[PDB]
């Protein structure tokens with residue numbers, strides 16, 4: 215605030231980037247929290263060509279705290295740097311993450327869908343996330359299924375109504391009869407929420 | 410050496426056909442026309458056939474504008490029922506472009522031969538991206554594994570990027586000096602062997618071919 | 621009839637102990653849940669294996685921030701949720717509440733400190749006495765510890781147990797045939813199962829502790845080959861590095877308590893088995909305190 219973005223960017227930005235690769239995850243999340251701050255005081259192009267891939271790098275991090283911090287920061291960036299920019303930069307990496315074999319990356323994807331969908335606009339949200347979210351419902355891991363149910367419950371009211379009914383209702387009906395108890399409970403809760 | 414010996418004059422008949430057929434002023438065939446021919450709702454193999462057959466006559470310098478359309482639309486060549494001559498002439502044109510326009514042609518060709526189910530599939534495979542990880546070129550659509558022309562293309566790409574990666578990481582370790590050479594040699598041997606193993610597994614008949 | 625349980629989980633995450641009646645109801649529910657579990661609890665492959673916690677509650681929250689919040693992350697705790705810590709009651713209550721609420725998404729195995737005598741000596745009994753003014757909560761919890769499964773079995777390959785092997789145990793069927801609903805004896809199968817350690821040794825050996833045995837590399841090799849196990853996960857011993865492979869990658873000791881009595885300074889680690897058993901250890905340091 216007192217030095218200005220120009221001097222810090224010329225001076226401390228490479229050091230900040232080097233710190234972002236630190237071993238201690240607490241240091242990394244300390245670096246993470248300022249991406250909305252840096253984003254507000256800096257243009258979209260320079261952040262896109264310097265730190266966007268770095269922001270994506272945190273999403274695949276081992277520690278869960280790092281991943282959720284990056285997820286919240288992605289929410290901040292999309293509400294700050296616009297919508298079509300996120301479609302050009304952020305959304306392809308999220309879709310790539312949806313194909314990951316490891317389940318935790320898919321859960322990072324579902325949390326990303328949760329945070330983005332609130333401020334990603336109705337049309338973009340449906341026509342991008344919904345094919346991605348719906349395919350994830352057939353995953354063998356029960357964790358994935360109940361997280362899909364929770365995600366549909368959360369991003370329910372924010373999308374279009376015809377698509378809401380026609381897409382969400384059959385798969386939630388499918389999840390209600392799924393054998394795992396948690397999937398049953400969360401699918402029932404989602405159906406009650408949607409009404 | 411394959412690209413260089415490709416440039417070597419064989420008989421000079423190509424120059425004769427250049428001076429004879431290209432004088433027709435049928436050079437109205439343009440990259441936009443070829444792109445339109447590719448993007449027909451039916452396959453319409455006749456128009457693309459005539460255009461690319463004409464492009465074989467073009468010298469390498471003036472064939473640079475057609476690099477974008479040929480590479481971008483080569484994914485469409487993987488579909489069933491494409492004539493062999495289309496792929497053969499695409500192979501010839503790609504070899505010519507490689508002789509004069511190698512690096513960016515390789516970048517765009519790898520970007521084009523992505524699986525396409527992931528659509529963009531991280532189209533940011535720049536020159537450095539392939540130069541650090543040569544095995545990316547093997548991460549391609551399964552249909553090329555039984556498409557001999559584009560498979561030959563991919564093999565050229567793989568050899569080039571293996572050598573490129575060798576020189577690249579040598580230069581990188583030199584500039585980052587400010588032992589590691591043993592790790593360099595081990596990484597290179599591992600990378601070459603891994604490429605060989607992937608190719609050998611490609612040679613295997615799949616279960617469908619087994620069926 | 622589950623909103624109260626989520627409220628308890630939320631309350632426990634802020635390190636606020638439940639009342640005696642709440643603990644009684646929780647122990648009743650847990651007993652009605654644990655009785656339907658075999659001594660060798662089958663566990664699906666995607667699971668985060670965690671070692672000892674020993675009541676270091678803030679470090680348990682550190683572990684949760686590392687590996688994620690349940691039920692979104694499957695967990696598997698190999699005993700020692702009590703003693704050697706100032707927040708044993710909160711830790712064990714949170715783990716039991718998670719077990720009741722999300723029985724499929726978390727598995728808790730019996731430790732060697734899950735015993736009446738060990739709790740009486742090493743200060744879980746004293747902590748219960750201070751935090752509740754009586755021994756009723758300690759009685760309820762120590763009754764529950766009899767029902768905790770002795771071992772686990774991740775995807776039929778990874779064998780998770782708190783302690784080591786036993787000279788009289790050389791088959792998973794033997795472990796399944798044990799009567800776990802009892803106090804940890806001073807000898808015999810389950811005592812060794814909970815108290816034994818590996819060692820750079822040939823054959824068996826009397827443990828430096830007062831119970832169990834020390835088994836060499838050949839023992840673990842024969843056990844693994846006979847039972848078709850690739851790895852024997854274990855958590856009974858301290859590890860400065862956080863985790864430590866043993867016996868040519870046949871046994872790995874996982875310690876999930878950063879520090880051990882807030883003085884050892886050891887690191888911690890948790891194994892993370894993914895959807896195809898591609899393991900990965902996530903080490904972490906003790907969380908900052910006031």
Ligand SMILES: [Mn+2]
Nearest residue numbers: 700732855856
């Ligand atoms: Mn122990």
Ligand SMILES: [Mn+2]
Nearest residue numbers: 672700856857
């Ligand atoms: Mn212990």
